[PDB]
Design a protein around this ligand. Structure first.
Ligand SMILES: CC(=O)N1CCc2c(sc3nc(SCC(=O)Nc4cccnc4C)n(Cc4ccco4)c(=O)c23)C1
Length: 110
């Protein structure tokens, strides 16, 4: 039985993957495939890749100790996007919008 706080995190994760946010969540569904995207410097710049499917697997495997560890992975995902891509890139605009959704509901932690 997940703790109350980790149940809240699982709900956040379900919302982030839902159709309601799919227009800006889609770049974060799967690990960045640097070779497929021609981003041949991605893994020289990003040392710890993260994506929503990895967060989902770690939640299902009970990897996360607490809500703080879950939130660190979600924020690592956004930070990687801000680090690698130029600030005017469309994916950065999508990252900002998905992070806005995350931060406001994470703040409602019970
Ligand atoms: C999280 C993060 O930092 N990422 C780096 C940047 C990026 C992605 S996913 C993605 N899709 C596209 S286009 C459709 C696509 O390529 N799909 C695809 C194809 C082959 C293999 N895997 C996929 C998903 N473009 C180009 C573009 C310019 C404006 C919006 O999108 C991207 O820059 C990215 C992840």
């Amino acid at each position: 039985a997940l703790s109350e706080q980790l149940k809240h995190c699982n709900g956040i994760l379900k919302e982030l993957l839902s159709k309601k946010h799919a227009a800006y969540a889609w770049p974060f569904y799967k690990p960045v495939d640097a070779s497929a995207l021609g981003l041949h410097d991605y893994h020289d710049i990003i040392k710890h890749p993260m994506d929503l499917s990895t967060v989902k697997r770690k939640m299902e495997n009970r990897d996360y100790r607490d809500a703080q560890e879950f939130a660190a992975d979600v924020r690592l995902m956004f930070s990687n996007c801000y680090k690698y891509n130029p600030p005017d890139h469309d994916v950065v605009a999508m990252a900002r919008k998905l992070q806005d959704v995350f931060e406001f509901r994470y703040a409602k932690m019970p």
